[PDB]
Design a protein around this nucleic acid. Sequence first.
RNA 1: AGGUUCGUGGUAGGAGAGCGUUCUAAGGGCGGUGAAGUCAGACCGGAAGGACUGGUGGAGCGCUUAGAAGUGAGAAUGCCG
RNA 2: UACUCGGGAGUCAGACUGCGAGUGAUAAGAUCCGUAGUCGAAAGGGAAACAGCCCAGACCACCAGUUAAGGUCCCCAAAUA
RNA 3: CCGAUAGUGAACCAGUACCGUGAGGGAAAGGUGAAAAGCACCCCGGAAGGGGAGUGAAACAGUUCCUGAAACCGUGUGCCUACAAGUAGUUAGAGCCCGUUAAUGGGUGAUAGCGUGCCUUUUGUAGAAUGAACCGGCGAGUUACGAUUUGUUGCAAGGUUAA
Lengths: 49, 101, 143, 112, 118
Amino acid sequence: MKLHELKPSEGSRKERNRVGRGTGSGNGKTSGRGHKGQKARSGGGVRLG
Amino acid sequence: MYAIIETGGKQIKVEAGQEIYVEKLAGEVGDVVTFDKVLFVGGDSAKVGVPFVDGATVTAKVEKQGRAKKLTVYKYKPKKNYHKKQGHRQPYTKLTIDAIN
Amino acid sequence: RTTYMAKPGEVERKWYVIDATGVSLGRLSSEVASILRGKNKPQFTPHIDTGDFVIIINAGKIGLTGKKATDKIYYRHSQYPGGLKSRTAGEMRTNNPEKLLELSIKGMLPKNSLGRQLFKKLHVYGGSEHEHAAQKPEVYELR
Amino acid sequence: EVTSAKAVAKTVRIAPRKARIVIDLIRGKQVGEAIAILKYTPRSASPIIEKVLKSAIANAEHNYDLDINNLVVEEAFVDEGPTLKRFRPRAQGRASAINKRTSHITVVVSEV
Amino acid sequence: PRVKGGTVTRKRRKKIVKLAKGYYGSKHLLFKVANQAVMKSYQYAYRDRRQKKRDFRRLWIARINAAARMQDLSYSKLMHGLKLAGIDINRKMLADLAVNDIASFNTLADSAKKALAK
RNA sequence: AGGUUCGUGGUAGGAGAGCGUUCUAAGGGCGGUGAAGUCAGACCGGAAGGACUGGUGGAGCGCUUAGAAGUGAGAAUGCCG
RNA sequence: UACUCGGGAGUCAGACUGCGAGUGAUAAGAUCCGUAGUCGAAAGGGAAACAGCCCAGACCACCAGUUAAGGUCCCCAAAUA
RNA sequence: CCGAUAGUGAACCAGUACCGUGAGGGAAAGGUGAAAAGCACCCCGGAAGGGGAGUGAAACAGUUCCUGAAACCGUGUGCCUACAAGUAGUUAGAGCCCGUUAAUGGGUGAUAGCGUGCCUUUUGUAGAAUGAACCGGCGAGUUACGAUUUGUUGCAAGGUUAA
Ligand SMILES: [Mg+2]
Ligand SMILES: [Mg+2]
Ligand SMILES: [Mg+2]
Ligand SMILES: [Mg+2]
Ligand SMILES: [Mg+2]
Ligand SMILES: [Mg+2]
Ligand SMILES: [Mg+2]
Ligand SMILES: [Mg+2]
Ligand SMILES: [Mg+2]
Ligand SMILES: [Mg+2]
Ligand SMILES: [Mg+2]
Ligand SMILES: [Mg+2]
Ligand SMILES: [Mg+2]
Ligand SMILES: [Mg+2]
Ligand SMILES: [Mg+2]
Ligand SMILES: [Mg+2]
Ligand SMILES: [Mg+2]
Ligand SMILES: [Mg+2]
Ligand SMILES: [Mg+2]
Ligand SMILES: [Mg+2]
Ligand SMILES: [Mg+2]
Ligand SMILES: [Mg+2]
Ligand SMILES: [Mg+2]
Ligand SMILES: [Mg+2]
Ligand SMILES: [Mg+2]
Ligand SMILES: [Mg+2]
Ligand SMILES: [Mg+2]
Ligand SMILES: [Mg+2]
Ligand SMILES: [Mg+2]
Ligand SMILES: [Mg+2]
Ligand SMILES: [Mg+2]
Ligand SMILES: [Mg+2]
Ligand SMILES: [Mg+2]
Ligand SMILES: [Mg+2]
Ligand SMILES: [Mg+2]
Ligand SMILES: [Mg+2]
Ligand SMILES: [Mg+2]
Ligand SMILES: [Mg+2]
Ligand SMILES: [Mg+2]
Ligand SMILES: [Mg+2]
Ligand SMILES: [Mg+2]
Ligand SMILES: [Mg+2]
Ligand SMILES: [Mg+2]
Ligand SMILES: [Mg+2]
Ligand SMILES: [Mg+2]
Ligand SMILES: [Mg+2]
Ligand SMILES: [Mg+2]
Ligand SMILES: [Mg+2]
Ligand SMILES: [Mg+2]
Ligand SMILES: [Mg+2]
Ligand SMILES: [Mg+2]
Ligand SMILES: [Mg+2]
């Protein structure tokens, strides 16, 4: 193949999701975390069990 | 002499030699369009249609097919983090009235 | 598109003289307000003046049905603490009928700059002769 | 051609708001009357504006060969310049800012 | 690699500040108030684009009523007669006839009177 | 690719398709007969956005297909001027 | 439409109105349950103004038409029926 | 990998200036032009600073000097404005002034209808609840190693190497 027309297999690569870049993308202000809990804090959450 | 014709879902008043803008019509530039839905013919003989008059028609010539100026439809709701932007451009057809029958 | 709009000074405004003998106050005022506003012509345009000029005579013989002649009260306040004044419809028909007709009609005109400008076209006399003989005024019969 | 001349005094230690109150008197007037006006106005900006005006007249007469007696003041304005930042010690161990402002003065004379 | 934010912010803010041209005071100079002004103007335009049709229909009805009262008819009676006869002229064109070609308006009113009494 | 029918308000939130920024690789380009930047316009696209013309500027910069991210600000009694 | 399996969540301060009860004084825009609706997350028309009441669910454009609640003397569209 | 708010605190006489009794804390600040050819001489002024003349491709490159945005401060002018109750706009609209990336064009707008900013937190905010003087720059889900699930590719009762 020629290096100026590379095309990887379709469905093998996807675009990363970035949260916190405006409200138009659906992951804006709260970034998929909800409102004011323990799970909404940096490094939050409880143990596995 | 003028007449009242129905086209594009609404009625419009016409005269010979007048240029009008209506909704998009099937027809190329230079063609001839006939409006067969005449509601009222006036001028020295006021004959009205119930609802349409008779085989009397109106003929016109297509001048231009295009789209109008650009709008920008915008909606938002305060404090709810909701916006929506969308542009619009309405197609039309420009005619010149030839004769009234 | 194409809808007719009038221009200032385009429409001819006439002069009318109206006799106010025996007619109820509000029923006369509604007709006069409609005449002044310009709603009786097919050239009506909301944002400009197309109405006529009205002269009212015999204002001292306006009617007041029921017992309004003695307990219909008009109030004013001077914006000083405790400065409210009151006047009955009676003795106001006798002393200053012009004020009675003027404020009754003024309550029916639109409350903006155009309404204030319209109110300047109303002339009311408590007697029978007006001062505007030079205009032409024509007699008008209420509907 | 070249029917007008100008002179500029740049970065003069005078606040613009105090010179734009004297320079509004001489706009659109004869040069003799303007000099007389600046002579009898007891403000602090009068000598500076007068010096600039006389310089403008002098280089209008010398470089461009016009007549002194036939001149008027077309334009006159004051523009801002760099400010020097100083401090003034207030009470209880804190200081407040002081702005020593400068200005640019321009006057243009021409034939009537 | 570092991506420093140049040339992209100003380009976007200047568009809004240009869209807010003609407003009073700082509403045509400063980005923060110009953005609010532009959003509010868009919302107002969206709503008035619906109220415009209502306003014009009211105006046409008022003019038709005024013209019909001169023929000893109400607006209600005239419209009922026109609907009963079988005439489908909208309010816009009736108002046009009333304003100018009043002869044709009177002919239509005669038709309505004929159908109404009948 | 063309049809028929039913739909198209929306917060937390789930899914999809995209615009733009910096760098790299290949192909193909323009530029002292004036690049990037900046200023002004009544142009184009469904949105993010993209052109064309002219003024200033005086030496670098696009386009197509992929790849990698210090990746897009109006708010934090935010830090600096 | 259901159901089973698997990936990702948010929510666990609710409010008023109609009906059925408790506490209260057969008080509260009170408090606590059952049942239906609306708001939350719903713009538009009527209640003067008005989250929760009455009518009714906004894909975009039109200077087109018919209706719902509510209305037709003037402000104010339509009956001085 | 960065490109002067970045990259070392420090691209420049930087652990300096400054602060503290002391240990200690700790900045700001890059660019004329290819070449100084860095403006002889004349005029106003005490000077600073200007206007000519000259050098230069350019002085609107003149010893914080490439480019020169916004806030902010001014000068001139086309339209409107001193009886009018204004989240400042939007829709209808006369008059006056212009003439474009030429198309049902541009600027200002007397008058009329409608209309209580943005964000956060809330059952509910125009809110007399919180935040922001304005403009500009900087400023927040990332990487390493494991687990699990979906997609793609190679081989397939086999697959695959680590150091
Ligand atoms: Mg994506
Ligand atoms: Mg969401
Ligand atoms: Mg936000
Ligand atoms: Mg929060
Ligand atoms: Mg939570
Ligand atoms: Mg102290
Ligand atoms: Mg002290
Ligand atoms: Mg870089
Ligand atoms: Mg930024
Ligand atoms: Mg304006
Ligand atoms: Mg939707
Ligand atoms: Mg819908
Ligand atoms: Mg998602
Ligand atoms: Mg060339
Ligand atoms: Mg050449
Ligand atoms: Mg670059
Ligand atoms: Mg350029
Ligand atoms: Mg591009
Ligand atoms: Mg960033
Ligand atoms: Mg800021
Ligand atoms: Mg500050
Ligand atoms: Mg599940
Ligand atoms: Mg629980
Ligand atoms: Mg609970
Ligand atoms: Mg409950
Ligand atoms: Mg109760
Ligand atoms: Mg309660
Ligand atoms: Mg909620
Ligand atoms: Mg509602
Ligand atoms: Mg409502
Ligand atoms: Mg009420
Ligand atoms: Mg709300
Ligand atoms: Mg009416
Ligand atoms: Mg720099
Ligand atoms: Mg540094
Ligand atoms: Mg010391
Ligand atoms: Mg150098
Ligand atoms: Mg010197
Ligand atoms: Mg010199
Ligand atoms: Mg020179
Ligand atoms: Mg030369
Ligand atoms: Mg250079
Ligand atoms: Mg410079
Ligand atoms: Mg500037
Ligand atoms: Mg007055
Ligand atoms: Mg006035
Ligand atoms: Mg208004
Ligand atoms: Mg509370
Ligand atoms: Mg307040
Ligand atoms: Mg708080
Ligand atoms: Mg505050
Ligand atoms: Mg496999």
